[PDB]
Each structure stands twice: as structure tokens, then as C-alpha cells.
Design a protein around this nucleic acid. Structure first.
Ligand SMILES: [Zn+2]
Ligand SMILES: [Zn+2]
Ligand SMILES: [Zn+2]
Ligand SMILES: [Zn+2]
Lengths: 143, 55, 56, 287, 46
RNA sequence: CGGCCUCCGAACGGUAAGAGCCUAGCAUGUAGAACUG
């Protein structure tokens, strides 16, 4: 019923206090997944999914790095079991990329002219304040 | 990438013992005297047939 | 580089489309069709990685 | 292609234009066959345009491959043609049109890529009628989006990102609403073109008098920067003048002519637009 | 599977007469009778 | 001291051809859009 656990090895011992958060995030990922596209499909259909993914992996990003309320080996188990996002994290660790919404929002090949989304340009350089909707995530100025 | 393995002789002898069933209990090739690829090539060319070989 | 995704992404697209009857998609119709030329690649790929009965 | 062919309005404003190319992208609704498609970012939050006719389908009539209006003046093709008095025989039926397009591309292959083919040059006497119906500034309302049918019923729940201008939709009772692109290209009953006809028919032009022996022409609004020899050089080699009265007590003039058709040429071409040293004169036939 | 189209020489069945006679590679049969799918569909719609 | 062991099934050729007729689909998703002394 959870993301059934493959490694067969016992999770290290900080799992029990991220336990209910992870479980709940999985349940609402399931619900927002089976959710019907009544005008919320098409371009915005996956707008919710990356939301839940970034949500979870940000949670773990705090609980290992900004609090140090968790063991290295636990958090390793919890990436290898597919909750977190090792690459998203190894970028989040950068200087200008603290809130990068979806790891596709900086894929330079994903766009015809060879750029990123305007989702990445800081709003001060824009000065136009027109609501910015990166199609992929729907996100609103991650940077 | 999962290539180029190196193994320990304990490992190897245990494995050998474990795959003992799907294996040949032969030590050399003097078994396959008139029963090898080249003998078969000659047969095929001469339209002769070894007792237990292909045609 | 090109980077991986959450599985739920594709899973959502695919259970979304289902069997392309809903007038919503209506263009992946023709792209779906054109994808037929490679269906014998998908099958060889799938079948050569099958799970080897000691693993679940 | 090398690049598109469209007016400034359709072409853009920023100094650096960005357009993406796809070879054999879609079908010219004129040549009917595959064309190249170049897609240009028109303006800030303004609808991205794309090339919408074969470059040969363009060099045929010398119009805009996106904006659809002529490239010299910029009025409906029906208008511009008639303003050159132009009468093209482009065939219409399916087989006839395909044969026509094929031989047309064959005949245009023998060109140098500089100017439209055929009567498009032997009709290049751009009449002041066309010059005057020609728009002056870039009517850049063209790159505003559609009517966001959601936002017309209420529904456009995407915030400000309504893909279309969330305004009041035009009552299609207007003849300026449904002009089939193919008909607009064929010069086939363009109601906007009939509007341009009514406008260029009601637009002021100089009037003719009754009797042929009224060969005195009153030019109203002279001013005291004019000379009699300057009124002459306005109306002198345009025929022969017989006399001229430069009324300084009323700031006008009167050319008695030696050829009636010469008088007509000078005056009718001069109506309110004979601008020598900047003064709006009025060419009429005097009393 | 279900082997769907029986082989009912339709010239015979409707008009009692097949031009091929003995060699008609189909079944000479004038029997009207509910098919292998007619009944399924009618019952399920019922 | 002798060993010798073919095969294997489906399609077309068989149950007319037609114009009209009428209506889903299926495709389109566009282009443009007004003026004065
Ligand atoms: Zn983005
Ligand atoms: Zn994004
Ligand atoms: Zn973002
Ligand atoms: Zn028969």
C-alpha cells in the first residue's frame, strides 16, 4: 500500500519521525494522480505532480540539511526508496538554485532557442510583473 | 556500467560447486575426436555421416 | 544533461489518455499512429529484460 | 526560402526579431503544396505569427505572406489591383488551378528573386488613389489575440493568461467579420475591400464644371509666399496656361488654360495636395 | 477466439439456388437462425 | 562392438459492380479587423 520497500534491509532509525509525513504525501500524490482532467488536464495535468514531488524532496532537504534532525544513512535509504530526488538535491545545493521548481526547468535542450524557462529569470530583471506560467510546472518564478 | 569483473577463488570454487548440476564432467577434448566442428565440416563436404552426427 | 522524472508523471499521462477516444487529445491520435513503426523495438526491449524467476 | 515576405505591421517592432524555421511545414492554401514555415514572435504578449503562403504564391500577386495586404500600399488586393486597373487571370478549379500552379512555379523558377512576376511591374503606376488609401502608421492591433471564448462566457479561469483578448466579442452581423482567407487572396468579394471602395469613393476629389468654355480655375488658399511664375511652374508644362490671376486680396488664384484636359490634369491631380512651399491650395474651375 | 463468419452461400440461402452447385465452397443452407453474436447483443441490451 | 528414424500452414483465386441519398465522425483550431479636419 505504501511505495512497497525493495531493499529488504531495515530502514535506519530516523525514518519513524518522517514516517507520517512521507505516508501522507504519498497518499495525496496518489489522489492528485487519479484526479480527472476537468480543465485541470492537458498543460496543467502534471502541474500538480511535480508540485508533490518537489514538496516531498524539499521536506527531506530541510530535515537533513537545514535541521540535521536525521541521519545520513536514513536519508540515503529514503532517496534510494524513491521519495527524494538525488539530482534535484545536488542542484538545490547550488548558489542560485535554492528553489528550482522542476528539474526540467533548467533543461537547456528542452527548448528550441537553448535557454531555460522564464520561470528561472529573477523577477527584478523582468520589471513587468505579468503572471509567469512555466508550462511544464505551472510554477511561478521559482527563482 | 557493470563490466570487467574480478573475483576471489573462494567465491569461484563455491559457485562451481553450486552450478555442478548444469555442467560438463569433462576434463579435455580427446572425447570429441571425430565429433567436432571440423570433422562435421569434412563430413558435410563429403556427404558422409558420422553415426551420431548431423546430416 | 537530460534528467529522470517521477514515475507518476508518465503514469498520469497514460491513464489520462487511456484509449484515445476522448476528443481532448485528438492530435496525439496521429502521433500515436505514427509510433507504430517502432512497436517491434519496444517489444524486443521489454522481453529481453524479464525478471528471471528468483526475483519478485 | 531565405526569409518571409510581410509588411512592417506583421513584421514587428523590436530590433532583434526571433523566428523559428520548419522545412516543408505546411500547405500554402494557394499553391496547395508543402511550403517552408517561419514563425515570428510579433510583440510583447502578442500572438506569434507564421508564414502563411508559398513564396511563389506570394511573388504571384506581390502581397504579404503573412499580413496578406500588398507590400507597396497595403490595401486589400482587390483594391490595389483595381487602383492599378489590374485584371489578373488566375485559374480557380482544382485541376485547372494545379496545372496553373505547376507552370507558374516553372515560369517563376526563371526569375532572380527581386520582384513579382508579370503585370505586377507593368501596373506599377501607383495611383494617388492607392497612395491616399494607404495606411500611415503600423496598425499593430493585429498581434492581439482572439476572444477567449471562456472569457466571453466567464470561464477563462487561468487568471490573466487568457490566451485571447478577454473583451466583448464582435457581432458577426458586421461584414468586417467573416472573410474567407482564400476569397481574400482571390480578391473574391472582400467586404473590407468594398469598404475601401466606398471610402475612396467618398474621399474628396476635385469637381468638374458644366460648360467647356469655363477654362478659368480658382485655387483657393494661396498666401503671400507664392509667385505668378510659381503658380505657373505648378501648372505650366502640365499643358499650356493662357493666364493667371493671383488674388492677393483674397489669397487665391485663377488659371485660364490653353488645353482643357491639361487643366484637368493639373487641377485634379492638385486637389488639396498641390503642396509647393507648404500651402493647401484648392483646385476648382472658376466662374 | 470466436470463429465469427460461418460460410453461408448467400445466393443459395436467400434464393434457394447457387450457381456453383456441388462446388460451392460454402454451406448450402436456407436456415434463418439467431447467430453467435445476435443473441449476445440483444440479451445484454436487455 | 556396434549406433543411421523426411514431413507438419495461412492468404488470394469464391459468393458482383455501381451513381444517388443522408447523417456522425474526421479533420480545422488559423489569417485578418475601419480613422480626421
Ligand atoms: Zn519552467
Ligand atoms: Zn517548471
Ligand atoms: Zn519555477
Ligand atoms: Zn452454392
Amino acid at each position: 500500500m505504501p511505495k512497497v520497500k525493495r531493499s529488504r534491509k531495515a530502514p535506519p532509525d530516523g525514518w519513524e519521525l518522517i514516517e507520517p509525513t512521507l505516508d501522507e504525501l504519498d497518499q495525496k500524490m496518489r489522489e492528485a494522480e487519479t484526479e480527472p482532467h476537468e480543465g485541470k488536464r492537458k498543460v496543467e495535468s502534471l502541474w500538480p505532480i511535480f508540485r508533490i514531488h518537489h514538496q516531498k524532496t524539499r521536506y527531506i532537504f530541510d530535515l537533513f540539511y537545514k535541521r540535521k534532525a536525521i541521519s545520513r544513512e536514513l536519508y540515503e535509504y529514503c532517496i534510494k526508496e524513491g521519495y527524494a530526488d538525488k539530482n534535484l538535491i545536488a542542484k538545490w545545493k547550488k548558489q542560485g538554485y535554492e528553489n528550482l521548481c522542476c528539474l526540467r526547468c533548467i533543461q537547456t535542450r528542452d527548448t528550441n532557442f537553448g535557454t531555460n524557462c522564464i520561470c528561472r529569470v529573477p523577477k527584478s530583471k523582468l520589471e513587468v510583473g505579468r503572471i509567469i506560467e512555466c508550462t511544464h510546472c505551472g510554477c511561478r518564478g521559482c527563482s | 556500467t557493470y563490466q570487467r569483473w574480478q573475483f576471489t577463488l573462494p567465491m569461484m570454487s563455491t559457485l562451481y560447486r553450486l552450478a555442478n548440476q548444469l555442467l560438463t564432467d569433462l576434463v579435455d577434448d580427446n572425447y570429441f575426436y571425430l565429433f567436432d566442428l571440423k570433422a562435421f565440416f569434412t563430413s558435410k563436404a563429403l556427404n558422409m555421416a558420422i553415426p551420431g552426427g548431423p546430416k | 544533461q537530460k534528467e529522470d522524472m517521477p514515475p507518476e508523471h508518465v503514469r498520469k499521462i497514460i491513464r489520462d489518455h487511456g484509449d484515445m477516444t476522448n476528443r481532448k487529445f485528438r492530435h496525439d491520435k496521429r502521433v500515436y499512429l505514427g509510433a507504430l513503426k517502432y512497436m517491434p523495438h519496444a517489444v524486443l526491449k521489454l522481453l529481453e529484460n524479464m525478471p528471471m524467476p528468483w526475483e519478485q | 526560402a531565405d526569409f518571409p515576405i510581410l509588411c512592417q505591421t506583421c513584421l514587428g517592432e523590436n530590433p532583434y526579431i526571433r523566428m523559428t524555421k520548419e522545412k516543408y511545414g505546411k500547405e500554402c492554401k494557394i499553391c496547395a503544396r508543402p511550403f517552408t514555415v517561419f514563425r515570428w514572435c510579433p510583440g510583447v504578449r502578442m500572438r506569434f505569427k507564421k508564414t502563411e503562403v508559398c513564396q511563389t504564391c506570394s511573388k504571384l500577386k506581390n502581397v504579404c505572406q503573412t499580413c496578406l495586404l500588398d507590400l507597396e500600399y497595403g490595401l486589400p488586393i482587390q483594391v490595389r489591383d483595381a487602383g492599378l486597373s489590374f485584371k489578373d487571370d488566375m485559374p480557380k478549379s482544382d485541376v485547372n488551378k494545379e496545372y496553373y500552379t505547376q507552370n507558374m512555379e516553372r515560369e517563376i523558377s526563371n526569375s532572380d528573386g527581386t520582384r513579382p512576376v508579370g503585370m505586377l511591374g507593368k501596373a506599377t503606376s501607383t495611383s494617388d488613389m492607392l497612395l491616399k488609401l494607404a495606411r500611415t502608421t503600423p496598425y499593430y492591433k493585429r498581434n492581439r489575440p482572439h476572444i477567449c471564448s471562456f472569457w466571453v462566457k466567464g470561464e477563462c479561469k487561468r487568471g490573466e493568461e487568457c490566451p485571447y483578448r478577454h473583451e466583448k466579442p464582435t457581432d458577426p452581423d458586421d461584414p468586417l467579420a467573416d472573410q474567407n482567407i482564400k476569397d481574400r487572396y482571390y480578391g473574391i468579394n472582400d467586404p473590407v475591400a468594398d469598404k475601401l471602395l466606398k471610402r475612396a469613393s467618398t474621399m474628396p476629389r476635385l469637381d468638374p464644371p458644366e460648360d467647356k468654355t469655363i477654362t478659368t480655375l480658382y485655387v483657393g488658399g494661396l498666401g503671400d509666399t507664392i509667385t505668378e511664375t510659381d503658380l505657373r511652374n505648378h501648372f505650366y508644362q502640365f499643358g499650356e496656361i493662357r493666364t493667371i490671376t493671383v488674388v492677393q486680396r483674397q489669397q487665391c488664384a485663377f488659371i485660364q488654360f490653353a488645353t482643357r484636359q491639361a487643366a484637368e490634369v493639373a487641377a485634379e491631380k492638385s486637389f488639396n495636395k498641390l503642396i509647393v512651399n507648404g500651402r493647401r491650395l484648392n483646385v476648382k474651375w472658376g466662374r | 477466439r470466436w470463429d465469427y463468419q460461418p460460410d453461408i452461400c448467400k445466393d443459395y440461402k436467400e434464393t434457394g439456388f447457387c450457381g456453383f452447385g456441388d462446388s460451392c465452397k460454402f454451406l448450402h443452407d436456407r436456415s434463418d437462425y439467431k447467430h453467435g453474436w445476435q443473441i449476445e447483443r440483444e440479451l445484454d441490451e436487455g
